Amino acid sequence: LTNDERILSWNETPSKPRYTPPPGAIDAHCHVFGPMAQFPFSPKAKYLPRDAGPDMLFALRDHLGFARNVIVQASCHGTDNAATLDAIARAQGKARGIAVVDPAIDEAELAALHEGGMRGIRFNFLPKDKFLEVAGRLPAGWHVVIYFEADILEELRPFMDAIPVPIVIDHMGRPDVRQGPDGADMKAFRRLLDSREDIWFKATCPDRLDPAGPPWDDFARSVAPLVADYADRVIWGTNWPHPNMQDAIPDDGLVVDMIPRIAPTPELQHKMLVTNPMRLYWSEEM
Numbered sequence: 001l002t003n004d005e006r007i008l009s010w011n012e013t014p015s016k017p018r019y020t021p022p023p024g025a026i027d028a029h030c031h032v033f034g035p036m037a038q039f040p041f042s043p044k045a046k047y048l049p050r051d052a053g054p055d056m057l058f059a060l061r062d063h064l065g066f067a068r069n070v071i072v073q074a075s076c077h078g079t080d081n082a083a084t085l086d087a088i089a090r091a092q093g094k095a096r097g098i099a100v101v102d103p104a105i106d107e108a109e110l111a112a113l114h115e116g117g118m119r120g121i122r123f124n125f126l127p128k129d130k131f132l133e134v135a136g137r138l139p140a141g142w143h144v145v146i147y148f149e150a151d152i153l154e155e156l157r158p159f160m161d162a163i164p165v166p167i168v169i170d171h172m173g174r175p176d177v178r179q180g181p182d183g184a185d186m187k188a189f190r191r192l193l194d195s196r197e198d199i200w201f202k203a204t205c206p207d208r209l210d211p212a213g214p215p216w217d218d219f220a221r222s223v224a225p226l227v228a229d230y231a232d233r234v235i236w237g238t239n240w241p242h243p244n245m246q247d248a249i250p251d252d253g254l255v256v257d258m259i260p261r262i263a264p265t266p267e268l269q270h271k272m273l274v275t276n277p278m279r280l281y282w283s284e285e286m
Contacts, residue, residue: 001036001048003036003050003051004050006036006048006049006050006051007047007048007049007050007246008049008050008246008249009049009050009242009243009244009245009246009249010052010240010242010245010249010250010252011249011250011251011252014063014064014251014252014253015251015252015253015254016063017064017065017252017253017256017257018253018257019065019256019257019259019260020065021064021065021066021256021259021269021273022266022269022270022273022274023067023274024067024068024274024278025065025066025067025068025273025274026066026067026068026069026070026235026273026274026277026278026281027061027064027066027068027069027070027236027237027238027240028069028070028202028235028236028237028277028280028281029070029072029170029202029204029235029236029237029238029239030057030060030061030069030070030071030072030237030238030239030240030241031071031072031073031074031084031240031241031243032052032053032054032057032071032074032083032084032087032241033049033050033051033052033053033074033076033077033083033241033243034049034051034052034053034083035051035053035083036048036051038083038086039077039080039082039083039086041076041077042076042077042078042079042080043078044078045075045076045077045078046075046076046244047076047244048076049074049076049241049243052240052241053087054086054087054090054091056241057069057071057087057240057241058090058091058094060238060252061094063252064238064252064253064256065256067094068094068095068096068277068282069091069094069095069096070095070096070097070098070119070237070277070281071087071088071091071095071096071097071098072084072097072098072122072145072237073097073098073099073100073122074243075100075124075243076243077100078100079100079101079102081097081099081100081101081113081116081118084097084099085097085113085116085117085118088116088117088118089116089117095117096117096118096119096281096282097116097117097118097119098118098119098120098121098122098145099113099118099120099121099122100121100122101113101121101134103127103130103131103133103134104130105134107137110137110138110139111139113139114139114142118142119141119142119143119280119281120138120142120143120144120145120168121134121135121138121142121144121145122144122145122146122147123144123145123146123147124146124147125146125147125148125152125156126148126149129159131159132159132162132163132164135163135164135165136164136165138165141283142165143165143166143167143168143200143280144163144165144166144167144168145168145170146160146167146168146169146170147169147170147171147173147174148169148173148174149173149174150173150174150175150176150185150188150189153173153188153189153192154188157192157195160195160199161195161196165198166198166199166200166280167196167198167199168200168201168202168235168280169192169199169200169201169202170202170204171202171204171205171208171209172189172201172202172203172204172209172223172226173185173189173192173201174208174209175188175189175209175222176209177206177209177210177216177218177219177221177222177223178210178211178218178222179222180221180222181221181222181223181224181225181226182225183222186222186226189201189226190226190229193230193233199233200233200234200235200276200280201226201230201233201234201235202234202235202236202237203223203226203227203234203235203236203262203263203272204236204237204238204239205239206219206220206223206255206258207242207245207248207255208245214251214254215254215261216258219258219262220258220261220262223262224261224262224263224264227262227263227268227272228268231267231268231271231272232271232276233276234263234271234272234276235272235273235276235277235280236259236272236273236277238252238255238256239255240252259272259273
């Protein structure tokens with residue numbers, strides 16, 4: 001099962017962003033796939049991606065003008081965090097990570113994840129409340145990363161109200177950006193952000209949220225006011241190498257170029273790309 005028989009989901013020659021990130025910018029949402037010969041995929045994987053290893057991730061990072069990454073365990077690796085852990089170590093201090101864990105994971109195994117640069121675990125609502133259970137015994141300084149869609153937010157509110165650690169929401173819970181910055185989903189999402197002092201969100205994935213394609217004007221107009229209103233709670237990522245996006249492969253250059261549209265001032269850019277992800281992933285440096 002060679003490399004070019006497996007699924008490519010990223011642009012192999014992405015454009016250079018016209019946007020220049022500030023020094024110390026963090027891509028807080030990216031992944032690695034394998035390399036398969038070193039780190040097998042999980043028997044449960046929905047599809048077998050091509051290798052997208054640390055070398056490619058760091059090349060992409062430097063190309064996009066970023067300094068650091070948060071490497072988020074990819075679902076093609078299940079609860080085996082080896083590939084992510086190896087990538088983080090290979091960043092030589094320039095990465096931290098998010099894990100996917102079996103809810104029966106040891107206190108000792110979680111401490112080893114911590115030592116290996118993990119600062120959280122991810123739940124994907126797309127095993128009822130073991131999730132609250134494991135979230136209550138995470139090493140200190142950890143958060144949970146959660147993904148959901150707008151249409152399940154209501155039924156999820158009590159669960160998230162219970163989570164004992166800070167919360168990071170991926171892609172803002174997938175609001176329908178066609179509605180505008182004051183539409184139903186954004187209203188519902190703001191209710192969530194207002195419920196707690198420690199709910200953060202990733203203002204990401206215009207490619208997924210906005211069915212119109214670039215320049216993703218609906219994403220820009222709907223998301224910029226959220227970023228402005230919740231500037232101390234927002235982070236950002238490329239989502240490279242774009243798991244399951246083989247039918248709509250984005251150009252990472254244009255993805256980065258959304259940053260100045262959703263965060264128009266240097267201060268908003270500084271918060272979203274440096275101050276906020278540092279507070280969450282490298283708190284010891286703050």
